[PDB]
Amino acid sequence: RDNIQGITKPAIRRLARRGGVKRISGLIYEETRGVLKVFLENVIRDAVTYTEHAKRKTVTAMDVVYALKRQGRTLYGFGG
Amino acid sequence: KVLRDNIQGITKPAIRRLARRGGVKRISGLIYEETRGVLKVFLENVIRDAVTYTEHAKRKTVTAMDVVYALKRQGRTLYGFGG
Amino acid sequence: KPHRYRPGTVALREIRRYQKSTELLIRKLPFQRLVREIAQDFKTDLRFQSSAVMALQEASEAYLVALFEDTNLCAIHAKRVTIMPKDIQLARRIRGERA
Amino acid sequence: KPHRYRPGTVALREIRRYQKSTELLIRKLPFQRLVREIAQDFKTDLRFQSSAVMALQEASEAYLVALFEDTNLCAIHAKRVTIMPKDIQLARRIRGER
Amino acid sequence: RRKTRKESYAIYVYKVLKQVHPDTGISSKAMSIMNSFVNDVFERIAGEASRLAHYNKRSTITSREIQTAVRLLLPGELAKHAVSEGTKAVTCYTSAK
Amino acid sequence: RRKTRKESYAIYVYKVLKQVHPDTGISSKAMSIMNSFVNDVFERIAGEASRLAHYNKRSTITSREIQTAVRLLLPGELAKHAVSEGTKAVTCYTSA
Amino acid sequence: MQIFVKTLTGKTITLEVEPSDTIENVKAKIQDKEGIPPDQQRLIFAGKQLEDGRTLSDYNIQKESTLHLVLRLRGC
Amino acid sequence: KTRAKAKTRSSRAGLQFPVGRVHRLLRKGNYAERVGAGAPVYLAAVLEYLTAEILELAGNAARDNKKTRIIPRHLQLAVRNDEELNKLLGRVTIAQGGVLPNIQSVLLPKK
Amino acid sequence: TRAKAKTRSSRAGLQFPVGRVHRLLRKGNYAERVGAGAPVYLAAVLEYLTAEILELAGNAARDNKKTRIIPRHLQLAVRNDEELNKLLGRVTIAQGGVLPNIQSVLLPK
DNA sequence: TCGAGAATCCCGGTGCCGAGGCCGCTCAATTGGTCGTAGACAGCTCTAGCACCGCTTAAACGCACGTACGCGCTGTCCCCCGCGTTTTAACCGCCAAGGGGATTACTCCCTAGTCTCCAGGCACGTGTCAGATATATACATCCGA
DNA sequence: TCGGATGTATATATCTGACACGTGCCTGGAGACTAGGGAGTAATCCCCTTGGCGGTTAAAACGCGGGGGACAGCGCGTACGTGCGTTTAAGCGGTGCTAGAGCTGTCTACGACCAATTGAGCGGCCTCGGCACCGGGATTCTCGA
């Protein structure tokens, strides 16, 4: 299950272009994939811990907001 | 008594010693003024918070607890002076 | 002769076009699959609400955009125009994220 | 004829010596005068406890040392050995300050 | 069909909007964002006031704690205007009865 | 004319130190640092547990809240060892 | 010295001031001449808001300069 | 023994935000043992002022773009273009916002 | 008649005061009611953390052939361990100092 | 310097769904009254923060000289960029099945509150040794020839 | 490539100020009992998540020519490091003084608590206008000459 490869190169190019980059080297993609993997790992671990404490089986939208707020990355507009 | 022109008390060798502890090797001739500005801004913020903390309690002497609380408010907490 | 643009024009056109709009940039289904695969390691047989996946996507895209902006600044400081992995590493080191 | 070291040796000696010790570097009385002068603008006729001044000095010194470390990294990144004000500006911009 | 009641600041935000801009609407996402903003600010101010009251070994939260928390949290011009508005509102409430 | 009583954590820290290293002393400023550290960690854990209890529409904090707050705050290995210590202590206290 | 103020009602009011005048003084003047209480009116000059704690001289209002008057509901 | 007609606490203070709801939330939020009779008024006034400022800026931005409704893009544009409001919401991401349209000067084409 | 008193800390087999922790939890305005098991858990966790840090600092002190612990030893113990450094990433210790590292580029040829 | 193509924006007609407003009703904010204690005010006592004066000596300052590095310029080589053609899977619409989230009622037991008793932790006083200084010496390291 | 000169680590004596420990005691923690509501448990409803099938079309993957950017090498001169003689003010050690922080009493005004009740706010329905979409033409750019 190598689903990390689903983040195609043109998507990363679009993200960089919105960021304001004009020229991109050929080795940025692996670094970007690693960074995204680490970030998702941390956030999802916190959300799953909240869900486990709540004694449920489906993670809701609220505990994702709580996990994001814990790391000082508050999010607006999703029922906070 | 009113004080004036005390920012220059931070001499060039003192900044050089701080940089040497920081691991630097060669220093350009324009670093000192920029460092003087940065330190002034930092102290201005911290003292601003501390004076408000002191004023809420109807006191007239700034205490170390006020400084500790002001530092903690900005996410740079300090150990070794109580609280 | 076929009409070609000099290398660089389409890049600026894309910059303007993509920082004018406010849509998402990653396809939904691959991201959902990645989220499920990552979350599988922590607890088996889980379920997700769609809004949770949407929130995760929004947060991830915002983080990546900010990181790329900082990387571009780092690249420009060194008298270059192309971003490189060392710029990302330096930005993450200064930000205090990487140990 | 007098014995002279090449430019660079004493810098490393100072680096080692000041990374081995822990005492403060900025003198006391100038710092106290600076603190009083800065605080004068918020409320006149104020008095200070000595421990407050000591804590302020400790925090300021730690902040300056960390900033200089980051500045050295920025200067090294661009194939250079001498630090320059633009390095400080870039470090402060990246850190998230205005 | 039984449905639980949920509370929100929607109607008050709409009242303020119709007070400031006579001819302008608002969408649902903007309303959610404003609700989150109001809740976040409320939580921050209340927490700071509680901490400040605890520091001075007192057991009551009054308008003075709110004033000092506002002065501690907001930047300059916002703090000045907010302090003025709060003092005016408190005086108006006290005078009337 | 005696002063008021100031609480502290010095006695228990000294006992733990004598338990780990039987022949090592400690100076005053290190004790102050340790006191501040203990107080700060206590405050963090208690606040996290309070917020966690508030989220779930509950009106009491039990050992489960403390365990989950410890899991959230501390990194991996420290979290595992602290969880083991806490559950062992609670079981021993209940048994007697 | 004379400033034109374009009001929201389509009427322009002429105010006699000095370059060193303060905003509380001009607010007293508009109180005297129209009676609209001071907290209700804001002035816009060159796209910049006029604040009470400053001097007309800081905002650089000169001869035949015009201002825009705006009104916001602020009951009691 | 004729109870007088009710008057909401928000009406006495000339406000719009509900004083009673704020008072109940302060009482039940585990902030302090007892709550004074002046704090909710101050809190409501401050919240009303901040909301009014944000809405004013967002409405100006929306009218600039020949539209009669406010969408999150207008809120983002209003917030990010004011230094004090930007400093207040430093670590907050707002959904469907986007980014401010800037391009580094050196990247621009030569001549 | 009555029986002699035995402290709850003795029952749990700890070195930290359970009763003081319970009182601080009750008076700290954290919740309406406080359970009877939370103080034991909190005391155990705090004791574990204190023991770990003290062991590392004592080892550092014994390295420098000294009998007492000074704040520099605490700084060295904290900064040389990964998880402890992560836990205290935004804390400055008075009289601490720094770690002796020099970038490889600056070294003489 | 000038001119032929592409990409973008302004304008007009049209259709759809969600934003604004209207009823009905149930729960929470008001009004009125009582009672207990939290804190505001006034007085007293003792500490530590401010001011000063003199002397010593370490640190800051100014100056001369030499050299190593920051920077501009030139050349090479190769690796991203723009464009065309083929492949593929994302998205949209529809249809089924059922697990798990969300209420509701009932009952046992866990914690708050009160009283009585006593011992553990804190402030105070005292001794003595761990270590910070001073002195002398052996060794590691740097720059020239 | 060796060898002289300088700075640092090693070993010994010594005397002080902080650390470790013994007492008195008094306030906070422990033992015993009640009562009352918070939470666990069993039962019911139905909503939203998971799964599958077909098409269709836009987006991704592959390949190719080439121009512009990354990087190495070199010359120059200027700013910065090192050392020396001179001048300045920080640091230590006392001496006086008084403003102000901290504690103790007391006494009242303010906030918690409870019963009746009524109007503010929330959920369901619907209806039409503001915005999205498609087609067309004017405009503004780029890149060859």
Residue numbers in the entry:
A (entry chain F): 23 to 102
B (entry chain B): 20 to 102
C (entry chain E): 37 to 135
D (entry chain A): 37 to 134
E (entry chain D): 26 to 122
F (entry chain H): 26 to 121
G (entry chain K): 1 to 76
H (entry chain C): 9 to 119
Reproduce the article's own wording on this structure.
The nucleosome is the fundamental organizational unit of chromatin and comprises two copies each of histones H2A, H2B, H3, and H4 wrapped by ∼147 base pairs (bp) of DNA. The nucleosome contains a conserved cluster of negatively charged residues in histones H2A and H2B, known as the nucleosome acidic patch, that is a hotspot for interactions with proteins that regulate transcription, the cell cycle, and the DNA damage response. Monoubiquitination of histones H2B-K120 (H2BK120ub) and H2A-K119 (H2AK119ub) play opposing roles in transcription regulation and chromatin compaction. Our results suggest a mechanism by which H2BK120ub serves as a gatekeeper to the acidic patch and point to distinct roles for histone H2AK119 and H2BK120 ubiquitination in regulating protein binding to nucleosomes.
To investigate whether H2BK120ub adopts positions that could interfere with the binding of proteins that interact with the nucleosome acidic patch, we determined cryoEM structures of nucleosome core particles containing Widom 601 DNA (147 bp) and ubiquitinated histone H2B-K120. The density maps revealed four distinct positions of ubiquitin on the nucleosome surface, denoted H2Bub positions 1, 2, 3, and 4. In H2Bub position 1, ubiquitin sits nearest the center of the histone octamer core, and progressively further away in positions 2–4. The secondary structure elements of ubiquitin in H2Bub positions 1–3 were sufficiently resolved to unambiguously position and orient the ubiquitin within the electron density maps. In all three positions, the ubiquitin beta sheet is oriented towards the nucleosome surface, while the alpha helix faces away. The ubiquitin in H2Bub positions 1 and 2 occludes large portions of the nucleosome acidic patch, as is evident when viewed in projection. At a probe radius of 5 Å, the acidic patch surface area occluded by ubiquitin in H2Bub positions 1, 2, and 3 is 1235, 891, and 405 Å2, respectively. Although the precise nature of the contacts between ubiquitin and the nucleosome could not be resolved, the EM maps for nucleosomes containing H2Bub position 1 and 2 show weak density for ubiquitin residue R74 interacting with nucleosome acidic patch residues H2A-E56 and H2B-E113. Ubiquitin residue R72 is also in a position where it could potentially interact with the acidic patch, particularly in positions 1 and 2. However, a cryoEM structure of Set2 histone methyltransferase bound to H2BK120ub nucleosome showed EM density for ubiquitin over the acidic patch, in close proximity to H2Bub position 1 in the present study.
